[PDB]
Amino acid sequence: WTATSGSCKGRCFELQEVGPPDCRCDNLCKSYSSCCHDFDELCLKTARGWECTKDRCGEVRNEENACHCSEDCLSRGDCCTNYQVVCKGESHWVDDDCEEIKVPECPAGFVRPPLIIFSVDGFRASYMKKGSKVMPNIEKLRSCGTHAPYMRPVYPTKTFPNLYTLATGLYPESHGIVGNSMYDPVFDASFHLRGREKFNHRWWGGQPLWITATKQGVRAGTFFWSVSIPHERRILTILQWLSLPDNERPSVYAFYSEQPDFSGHKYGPFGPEMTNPLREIDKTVGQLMDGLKQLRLHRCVNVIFVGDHGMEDVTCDRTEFLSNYLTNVDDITLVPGTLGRIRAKSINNSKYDPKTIIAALTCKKPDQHFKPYMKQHLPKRLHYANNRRIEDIHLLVDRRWHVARKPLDVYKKCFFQGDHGFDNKVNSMQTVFVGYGPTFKYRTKVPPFENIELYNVMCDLLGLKPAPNNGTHGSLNHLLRTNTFRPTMPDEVSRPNYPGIMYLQSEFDLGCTCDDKVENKLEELNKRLHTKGSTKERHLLYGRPAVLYRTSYDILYHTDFESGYSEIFLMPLWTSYTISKQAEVSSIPEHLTNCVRPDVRVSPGFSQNCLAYKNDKQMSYGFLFPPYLSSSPEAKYDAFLVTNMVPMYPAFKRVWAYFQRVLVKKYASERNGVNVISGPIFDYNYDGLRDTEDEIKQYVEGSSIPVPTHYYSIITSCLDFTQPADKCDGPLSVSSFILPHRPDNDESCNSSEDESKWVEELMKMHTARVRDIEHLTGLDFYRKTSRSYSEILTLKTYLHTYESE
Ligand SMILES: *[C@@H]1O[C@H](CO)[C@@H](O[C@@H]2O[C@H](CO)[C@@H](O[C@@H]3O[C@H](CO[C@H]4O[C@H](CO)[C@@H](O)[C@H](O[C@H]5O[C@H](CO)[C@@H](O)[C@H](O)[C@@H]5O[C@H]5O[C@H](CO)[C@@H](O)[C@H](O)[C@@H]5O)[C@@H]4O)[C@@H](O)[C@H](O[C@H]4O[C@H](CO)[C@@H](O)[C@H](O)[C@@H]4O[C@H]4O[C@H](CO)[C@@H](O)[C@H](O)[C@@H]4O)[C@@H]3O)[C@H](O)[C@H]2NC(C)=O)[C@H](O)[C@H]1NC(C)=O
Ligand SMILES: O=C(N[C@@H]1COC2(C1)CN(C(=O)OCc1cc(Cl)cc(Cl)c1)C2)c1ccc2nn[nH]c2c1
Ligand SMILES: [Ca+2]
Ligand SMILES: [Ca+2]
Ligand code: NA
Ligand code: NA
Ligand SMILES: [Zn+2]
């Protein structure tokens, strides 16, 4: 119940929301069906439209008009945005030369440059170039301020997951808005775009920017706008708020446009009908900037122009139907479209079985346009598993396609020609970022970055401490002229042991064998040198990784590689080695095929054993430093140390052996040498964070050797590839991956073919940031370089995407 009989007189677009049942006059009252009886009359005036004309200049003020052109309007803060242009001979902002904003030029009483976020739904990154001729205001923001060629959204590339990630710095699995539609089994409640459940605060986790600001004494404009409030009135409302007295005036504002998404769904991303929505968005930017110029705020405010996601061509005919795969299609509930999520239709059905649904959906049709995953097996870069609102079965849908349960869902719900939601590395899904103002840099292009990083920067622009989030604070310092955040590197928590030779061969009873008992002061001194770290500068290029939790581990040196060996997990946490352009690949010699060698530096009690592998009929082993890339026949023996062994399913060994035997040398040839750090990851609770010992669900049978859920590698070289990776004077270049350690290759439909036809495709799908590996391992990389720490933070957030230009 709302008592709509109160009045909006002097309350139009009030910032503080009044509680039930008193009627509202805020920018969201329409959405709650709660506005006072006279809200339209008083607050949504439209008389005489939105632009001053010559005959209106100096008019007698008529309070009925949508905006004003009377002499008093600047002091009232309610002129039409073109008032000074029409009536006072001023230029449009877009027609002025751009001139660097070296310091804020703000009116007296301004404590800080305000921030205005101008968000555009469905604005695909390539519109910035492809539509530039019809968007002169946006093109001036872009060219004169700071811009990226694109900004990467979060998955799924849907509206509310992205907007709320922009507002919070959090992945959707952490803020809880994991789709535009959701079921929460704990609440037993459903979130939909239509209706009231979506306003309940229990959906919305983390701390959005307007709450962060308010708690720290910085006032905020309200971020959401009811759909019926026209854009011209939104801009005029912002400009009016900006004319409030100092103590009442907000410092952060948001404008939202439902375009170009609205038309992109109807006409496709490049439909000829798309030009007009781009022109109309540009005209709105023009109104805001002209309005700021009138207020003498155009060299005071920071403006961010940012989208939520892009738009792909998708039509009704490119739909896969689960009814062509599943016998039991009526026993499942599907959340459909550009991603699929499956759960049981009834929790009382004991015939429901996820394993049989997955198998029925796996590589069943030659050109199949979606792939099923248990959520924990999704690429870790999507960070899309750790929330009870994310169903266990996920379908990753190919770009340009939909999935649906039955054909009748698609015609009894072609209309649409565009959609979004796909994998956030897909080029069509990328969106836009421009920052313009005194705090942003002038005429500066920055590399693409992820939208999870923006919250921290918005906090920096407002002098706020960000709530805990998934950005890496400092990684976007290069966007900013001032207000940079200068983090310190985390402190190392565990220091390593450096063991020398402490055990005789006969103390070991590991069930291992090696044909190495075939045997010089010219060469004995040299091998002792290698075991003390004489080659370490070659193989450990950026310092040893820091271990940021409490544990017991040893540094182990060798001719060709260095490692951090965990006494708790019985294997390395990391193994580091450099492969030059000139390196040669060799075979594992016949006499050494099954060779494993006790490491006389590490106790039998803290070693793996070969008997456990012999007895575990499902599990084999591989090596982290590859024997194929040994520097000499004699150095090759080090590669067979029991301290370089890790557990690997035979199916996974196909992937790993091809990476090590073929791809590392290919990368060194292409990049002029590479430094590789490889290791295990344990994330059995799929939270994206390093497991403790007591979270491990699987061991090599009969033993205490834990089985990794994934194996990672970080592959670094010189950005200037004219310099070899081990003699690089300047910035670095990195690519990394986190491969799932699975007992089959069912994810790769072509895995019966030679590894040359499918392995690298798998690796690309599981591309990762170094920061993703940091979270998963509790390690901190690149501690000793010649680079600034913020530059290193940017490097650690880099994702190599393998998408075309
Ligand atoms: C991305 O960045 C974010 C933000 O930094 C990272 O997420 C943080 O990660 C922490 C570890 O997973 C987590 O810390 C836990 O906090 C618990 C208290 O949580 C509440 O309070 C906070 C602070 O206000 C609040 O933000 C929380 O909000 C979450 O939960 C509500 C639902 O109630 C959601 O609306 C909201 O969206 C958010 O959900 C997300 O996080 C939760 C986990 O909290 C997930 O379950 C969701 O699926 C979703 O992802 C909460 O309201 C605290 O209770 C925990 O402490 C337990 O564990 C420690 C182990 O050290 C132990 O000392 C304690 O005793 C305790 O154990 C006891 O409980 C266990 C489970 O019940 C039980 O097994 C034991 O036997 C014990 O009884 C823990 O400290 C922190 O909350 C989140 N924050 C957010 C916002 O998500 C995220 O990790 C980053 N991601 C990556 C990949 O880097
Ligand atoms: O636009 C859609 N839905 C409605 C219309 O407007 C909304 C919900 C109100 N809100 C708002 O004013 O946003 C301000 C803001 C800025 C930041 Cl930077 C951060 C935040 Cl959190 C909010 C967005 C929609 C729905 C379904 C779809 N399916 N496909 N495409 C779809 C689009
Ligand atoms: Ca959207
Ligand atoms: Ca974990
Ligand atoms: Na075995
Ligand atoms: Na396969
Ligand atoms: Zn949309």
Swiss-Prot record:
InterPro entries recorded:
Alkaline_phosphatase_core_sf (IPR017850), DNA/RNA_non-sp_Endonuclease_sf (IPR044929), Endo_G_ENPP1-like_dom (IPR001604), ENPP1-3/EXOG-like_nuc-like (IPR020821), His-Me_finger_sf (IPR044925), Phosphodiest/P_Trfase (IPR002591), SMB_chordata (IPR020436), Somatomedin_B-like_dom_sf (IPR036024)
Query: Which coenzyme or cofactor does it need?
Result: Zn(2+); Ca(2+)
Motif Cell attachment site at which residues?
A: 76-78
Q: Where is this region: Nuclease-like domain?
A: 541-805
Under which EC number(s) is this enzyme classified? 3.1.4.39, 3.1.4.4
Q: Which residues are glycosylated?
A: 3, 348, 360, 470, 750
Q: What is its main location?
A: secreted
Q: Which Pfam families match?
A: Endonuclease_NS (PF01223), Phosphodiest (PF01663), Somatomedin_B (PF01033)
Which SUPFAM superfamilies has this protein been placed in? Alkaline phosphatase-like, His-Me finger endonucleases, Somatomedin B domain
Q: What, per the annotation, is the impact of changing residue 159 to S?
A: 15% of wild-type lysophospholipase D activity
- Biological process (GO) annotations? cell chemotaxis; cellular response to cadmium ion; cellular response to estradiol stimulus; estrous cycle; immune response; negative regulation of cell-matrix adhesion; phosphatidylcholine catabolic process; phospholipid catabolic process
Catalytic-site annotation from UniProt: 159
Q: Where does 1-tetradecanoyl-sn-glycerol 3-phosphate bind?
A: 159, 180, 261, 420
What is the reaction catalyzed? a 1-O-alkyl-sn-glycero-3-phosphoethanolamine + H2O = a 1-O-alkyl-sn-glycero-3-phosphate + ethanolamine + H(+); a 1-acyl-sn-glycero-3-phosphoethanolamine + H2O = a 1-acyl-sn-glycero-3-phosphate + ethanolamine + H(+); 1-(9Z-octadecenoyl)-sn-glycero-3-phosphoethanolamine + H2O = 1-(9Z-octadecenoyl)-sn-glycero-3-phosphate + ethanolamine + H(+); a 1-O-alkyl-sn-glycero-3-phosphocholine + H2O = a 1-O-alkyl-sn-glycero-3-phosphate + choline + H(+)
List ligand-binding residues for Zn(2+) 1. Answer: 121, 159, 308-309
Which SMART domains does this UniProt record tie to the protein?
Endonuclease_NS, NUC, SO
User: Which CDD domains does the record associate with it?
Assistant: Enpp, NUC
Q: Which residues does this entry assign to the site Essential for catalytic activity?
A: 796
Superkingdom, taxonomy of origin: Eukaryota
> What Gene Ontology cellular-component terms does the record carry?
extracellular space; membrane
Q: What does this protein do?
A: Secreted lysophospholipase D that hydrolyzes lysophospholipids to produce the signaling molecule lysophosphatidic acid (LPA) in extracellular fluids. Its major substrate is lysophosphatidylcholine. Can also act on sphingosylphosphorylcholine producing sphingosine-1-phosphate, a modulator of cell motility. Can hydrolyze, in vitro, bis-pNPP, to some extent pNP-TMP, and barely ATP. Involved in several motility-related processes such as angiogenesis and neurite outgrowth. Acts as an angiogenic factor by stimulating migration of smooth muscle cells and microtubule formation.
The record comments on the domains as follows: The nuclease-like domain is most probably catalytically inactive as residues that are essential for catalysis in the DNA/RNA non-specific endonucleases are not conserved. However, it is required for the stability of the protein and the catalytic activity born by the Phosphodiesterase domain.
> What protein am I looking at?
Autotaxin
The scientific name of the source species is Rattus norvegicus (Rat)
Q: What is the lineage of its organism?
A: Eukaryota, Metazoa, Chordata, Craniata, Vertebrata
* Name of the coding gene: Enpp2
